[PDB]
Structure 1
């Protein structure tokens, strides 16, 4: 099928300039005894206009929408395919494109082919017209900065946490833990699985959470933010939770973000939040993604691809990991993921992308961070225009959750001032106490801290 579904003489520069194709770059390894080009061509066919044999029903018009392999490097195990724009599904309702079609064609059936050892998407290019037909984000970090009374341009670090334990707190205990963090921090979110468990019903816990928000706001003089999980199988269940949340928070309802477990939940749930509640910050939680985005995986698509898709879907923010600075699987090069979702112009691993003013998706950092690890994280990224949720780093603090929230903020102020963390600790109590809260991390990152800070009987 090489003759029909491959044209290795096409120039990528031309395919991009034309603006008539979505381009996709994969890593690929063919099965034993299978030629590399024929594998790529079969993938292109199975991912667009054909199957594994000739069919009587094929006409010449069909060939015009064939996906085409325009580049392969067998030595490097790379293949690139051009997908004509007209292949992708459109809403009958409003003509917009849908991400589920992109997934179906470009990373659907080709993941189960017997003649393919493995196939993973590394990057993709979206031309101007296709980008115009995606929803894109309706809210972004600047809306949160505005609420917090900080500059809508470069408003900087937003301190946050997840309520701990991840499951098991009853309504009153849950509301109290929320209150305690907000005395020092900006941002609280449900842990990914917390919803309407029988031991902590939503109708009971949420009004109490709002009371905690009000009390913290009155006492601190600062606005507070809450990100609520509305993930659910039933579309109308999602809307029921959402409707109840906004009514409950009343005059502070703009401060309610909606969290959706978008990876295991799928594009449907993300779009429900985005289209039915565009005026609420949409928080994309990627739980489960590791099953394909892991460094050891040669299937599906990468974390980078996921983040870039989420921006098109209309996520206000998305988890991008800790880039090797915490407890999940990530490395320092993952900073490109944040750049791609927050900048108007950025170059991915294979494709440069212009966003033409589409709103930025906030990079949200979570997973094993604390005040001691943050200075190193910020140095790698180059800035702090982020939301940083730290469950362990906050509730794990020896003094209080509030002190934990403060320690996170002081760590950012330390890095921003370009100061020495140990010396910074000498003038910032909460930050200093984080060393004693997480001594194993302290010994590794800042050896000799006990001696320098006078932490001894």
Structure 2
């Protein structure tokens, strides 16, 4: 046990100098919960496997503090002086501190970060989002309703032309948003430049035919940084402003890719695809961090949007509690975790305008105009994975909002009447939800929705 990291009940951890975190910890045979907590606090801040002999009073003043313990639920509260984190809003460094070596410690059998708190003084040091769902809505000229999008399937194997065709068919069917599948890139059979050019041409045709703008999120994840920047610059040169978003495989490409795109292209929607996060977040893995934590850090890094899950309605792991908590972490000015209440404002909570905005948000009013110096911009939850027209309404009911992007892959492209019909089916299912008519009743005179009922049941 390293007692130098144990200060149970210390009231100074709430003074704005500390980022707080809750771990579910369980050490090997012989270690108590507080012992495991002291060792984790040591390995996630200033120490190592034994008391550090070269420590100075200063470095000891920057120690992480285990300040609360719950033995029954194997919970531990640790406080991190965020001064120890790399400056310049380095988020990968935060994850290195709190989600780094502690996951490999042989003496820790369970190590799951369940919640984290960012004090306003800490929020000051980080980017936060810059282009929001509201900006995309402005470009698309669609208000209030969810943004309806698709993932082009198959995940890999189409040529650039076939890919642009599926884009055209989806948009032309009333769809608003198309994203690359996360691994689609510069494969020889699907040249990336030609993919961009064909997407542009297809978008021009849809805009001509319908008078409506559309949006495509391009995957720019690459081998190195030079290639990603090359792809992004090409897209900028080929697509009209607001008509394109930048998708990054955040987990496998890394937080640095996210922050770099956020800072280099602040006026472009940054689409944080989280392929691989399961190893961190899945309930079955006792070591890692949960999806709410991932989402809060993705907002901290500045992602315009991140996938937050379908609350168990689709095919990816999750329940209404965690996934809806994630969507609220992304959207709300005041969001509640399992253990910390978060206000996404760099201003003291006592401010009258802030409390007013919080009250107005509880009443349904927008806080986005509250002041660039006063809020962390909202981030967009992206709802994907096993969705089809039959499930969108259930999701809307579960999350309690319509401020999000849904993306459907096989839920659109496997529709018996084709992609265009699949997009029409999702729009008709949304109308069914909006008019409070059952999908069976509404589909009586909607052929596309009726076929979606046939295939997806």
TM-score between the two structures when normalised by the length of structure 1: 0.91
| 1:75 alignment partner in structure 2 | 72
1:372 CA drift (Å):
0.8
The answer for the alignment partner of 1:426 in structure 2 is 444
Aligned to 2:158: 169
Matching of residue 135 in structure 1 with residue 127 in structure 2: yes
User: Alpha-carbon deviations, 1:402-446, whole Å to 9, x = none?
Assistant: 1211211222222222222211212433222211232xx2xxxxx
Q: SS at the partner of 1:426?
A: helix
Please list, as runs of the form range in 1=range in 2, the aligned pairs for 1:357-376 lying within 5 A after superposition: 357-376=375-394
Structure 1 residue ranges (4+ consecutive) displaced by more than 4 angstroms after TM superposition: none
> Which of 119, 142, 149 in structure 2 is aligned with 1:150?
142
Contact 1:2 1:37 in 2 (8 A): no
Matches within 5 A, 1:54-93: 54-90=51-87
Identify the residue that residue 412 of structure 2 maps to in structure 1: 394
Distance 2:182 2:244 in 1: 16
Cα distance in 1 for partners of 2:10, 2:209 equals: 64
C-alpha deviation, 1:289, in angstroms: 0.8
Work out the CA distance in 1 between the residues paired with 2:152 and 2:51. 57
In structure 2, how many angstroms separate the alpha carbons of the residues matched to 1:37 and 1:240?
A: 50
Aligned-partner SS, 2:242: helix
Which residue of the partner structure matches residue 421 of structure 2?
403
- Name the structure 1 match of 2:171: 182
Q: In structure 2, the residue corresponding to 1:102 is in which secondary structure? A: helix
Residues 1:224 and 2:242 are matched in the alignment: no
The CA distance in 1 between the partners of 2:52 and 2:241, in whole Å, is 57
2:90 is aligned with 1:98:
yes
Conservation of the 8 A alpha-carbon contact between 1:379 and 1:415 = no
Aligned to 1:286: 274
1:321 and 2:339 are equivalent in the alignment: no
Superposition deviation, residue 392 in structure 1: 0.7
1:127 is displaced (CA, Å) by: 0.6
Please name the residue that 2:350 is paired with: none
Q: Is the 8 A contact 1:30 1:39 kept in 2?
A: yes
Asked if the contact 1:247/1:253 (under 8 Å) is kept, the reply is no
Partner of residue 195 from structure 1, selected from 164, 176, 185: 185
CA RMSD of aligned residues (A): 1.3
**Residue equivalent to 2:199:** 209
Separation in structure 1 between the aligned mates of residue 141 and residue 53 of structure 2, nearest angstrom: 66
Q: 2:72 and 2:413 mapped to 1: Cα distance?
A: 50
Alpha-carbon separation, structure 2, partners of 1:53 and 1:383 = 50
| 1:235 and 1:272 in contact (8 A); partners too | no
Deviation for aligned residue 1:2: 4.5
Alignment check: 8 A CA contact 2:24 2:113 kept:
yes
CA contact under 8 A between 2:89 and 2:125: conserved in structure 1?
yes
CA shift, 1:238, in A, is: 0.6
Contact in 2 for aligned 1:170/1:199 (Cα 8 Å): yes
Equivalent-residue separation in structure 2 for 1:56 and 1:339 (angstroms): 45
Any gaps of 5 or more consecutive residues in structure 2? 346-374
The answer to whether the Cα contact below 8 Å between 1:162 and 1:191 also exists between their aligned partners in 2 is yes
Instruction: Output the TM-score relative to the length of structure 2.
Output: 0.91
